[PDB]
Amino acid sequence: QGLMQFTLPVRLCKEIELFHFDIGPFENMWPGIFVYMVHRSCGTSCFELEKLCRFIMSVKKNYRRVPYHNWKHAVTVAHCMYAILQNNHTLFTDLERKGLLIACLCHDLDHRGFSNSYLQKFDHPLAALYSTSTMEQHHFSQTVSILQLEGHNIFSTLSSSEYEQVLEIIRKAIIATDLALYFGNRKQLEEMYQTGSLNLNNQSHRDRVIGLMMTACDLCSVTKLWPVTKLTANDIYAEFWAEGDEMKKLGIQPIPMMDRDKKDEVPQGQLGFYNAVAIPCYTTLTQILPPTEPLLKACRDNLSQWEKVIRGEE
Ligand SMILES: Cc1cccc(Sc2nc(N3CCN(c4ccccn4)CC3)nc3[nH]cnc23)c1
Ligand SMILES: [Mg+2]
Ligand SMILES: [Zn+2]
């Protein structure tokens, strides 16, 4: 370090502050985008540059060459969190700002392009090791492994106390990415918000709010400009349909979302997803963190584009 500020070209310097920023097709610029985001979000002092680069490059190595749950998804999910953190300056601790960008970059480590359900039906060894939130417990395990490599401990300067707390923020943040757990989390957050019992001093409340941030960042393809949203859906389905194929090989009719023979049902299925998951997620997030409103607005714009697809207006 330490007078070594990372900088981005003008168009990226400006648009990286916006929720809808797409990190672009130059894979080699994504590490520098991430460090940029950490330095602005956290400080140039929060991590040793040399250790952080070595950490980022080992995380990159442990993402696989799958259509969707790949390195680009990691960095995309970290960028959405950066936008939330940067629009809610004073709401988060020093430990949270550190923990959360790392959690996001690590949240799908070593993903195989398959659901928890497929692992359980296949009888994968990971389904015996972790009976629920199977892949998410794996992702946390891989994060701790990489942190324990020589010269990769980016948290070396924290106390024993602060280190346990940061690894506990990261653990809960990664587990929250199990969508099966989002529905209950959001229903509790909506009841708390509306009875006026939400209290950001209650750690148990903070945990829930961070959980919803994680879902919101994880689903963020639905908050992009329509051409990004549409082209990302193709990647998401390329994985799901491959899973459907593997389900057919185990002798199981997959759900239509994973059946490439039911492509025609994609538009109507998107409407359900927006209405059942995405719109409620960003609505509750906006209630708790009003400056995240542009995520909800973008999502509502993308629901309207899928409505037009169904009407054959595209
Ligand atoms: C942005 C995006 C694009 C593709 C997939 C997802 S994840 C996802 N999508 C849905 N939806 C959408 C897909 N939908 C169908 C149905 C028939 C055919 C095609 N699609 C079924 C409900 N339901 C879910 N339940 C748990 N996770 C999901 C997100
Ligand atoms: Mg995941
Ligand atoms: Zn993810």
Domain boundaries, the chain: 29-311
Specify the DSSP class assigned to residue 69: S
Q: How far apart are CA 207 and CA 112, in angstroms?
A: 27
CATH of 29-311, one of 3.40.30.10, 1.10.1300.10, 3.40.50.450, 1.10.10.10: 1.10.1300.10
Q: How far apart are CA 127 and CA 9, in angstroms?
A: 45
- CA-CA-CA-CA torsion sign (117, 118, 121, 124): negative
Q: How far apart are CA 167 and CA 99, in angstroms?
A: 7
Resolution (A): 1.9
Q: Which of 181, 270, 279, 282 to mutate to test the pocket of ligand 1 (most atoms within 8 A of CB)?
A: 270
Q: How far apart are CA 99 and CA 122, in angstroms?
A: 33
Task: State the distance from the centre of ligand 2 to the C-alpha of 311, rounded, in angstroms.
Answer: 32
Identify the nearest ligand to the CA of 177 by its number: 2
CA 232 to chain centre: 14
Please state the atom number of ligand 1 nearest to the C-alpha of residue 259. 18
For 68, the token pair is 């969707």
Q: How far apart are CA 163 and CA 108, in angstroms?
A: 21
User: Which structural technique was applied?
Assistant: X-ray
Q: Catalytic site residue 69?
A: yes
Cβ pair 230, 60 in contact under 8 A: no
**E strand segments, 154-289:** none
Query: What are the angstrom distances between the C-alpha of 3 and each of 35, 39, 44, 45, 47?
Result: 14, 12, 9, 10, 14
Cβ pair 39, 82 in contact under 8 A: no
Q: Longest C-alpha distance within the chain, in Å? A: 60
For 192, the token pair is 């708390």
Backbone angles phi and psi of 44, in degrees to 5: -75, -10
| Coil/strand/helix, residue 253 | coil
Q: Which residue numbers belong to the known binding site for 3',5'-cyclic GMP?
A: 69, 270
- Number of C-alpha atoms within 13 angstroms, CB side, residue 265? 12
